[PDB]
Design a protein around this ligand. Structure first.
Ligand SMILES: *[C@@H]1O[C@H](CO)[C@@H](O[C@@H]2O[C@H](CO)[C@@H](O)[C@H](O)[C@H]2NC(C)=O)[C@H](O)[C@H]1NC(C)=O
Lengths: 49, 35
């Protein structure tokens, strides 16, 4: 859950692999895209509530 | 000076201030999604 600890962006999981004197991690990340603009409001008034 | 020298840093203070300002603007405006 700690941000950017492993993989740039939201993290899903990872795969390990060996190397002659080290390790290699493959991080799978989720990246949102195709953003659209909208207009919001914090609260809705109904029946005086 | 008798054989000792001082080298200048690669990044000047101005670009450091620019990075700090960019980070601050990004975190105020977009929250955390920009990270
Ligand atoms: C949200 O709506 C605004 C209003 O149209 C859009 O704002 C544009 O933003 C770009 C980049 O800053 C400017 O170059 C345009 O002039 C803006 N249009 C205006 C002020 O009419 C914006 O694209 C929409 N979407 C988002 C994600 O902000």
């Amino acid at each position: 859950k700690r941000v950017d600890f492993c993989g740039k962006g939201y993290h899903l999981m990872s795969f390990p692999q060996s190397a002659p004197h080290g390790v290699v991690f493959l991080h799978v990340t989720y990246v949102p895209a195709h953003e659209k603009n909208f207009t919001t409001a914090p609260a809705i008034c109904h029946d005086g509530k | 000076f008798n054989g000792l020298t001082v080298l200048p840093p690669l990044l000047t203070d101005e670009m450091i201030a620019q990075y700090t300002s960019a980070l601050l603007a990004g975190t105020i405006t977009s929250g955390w999604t920009f990270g």
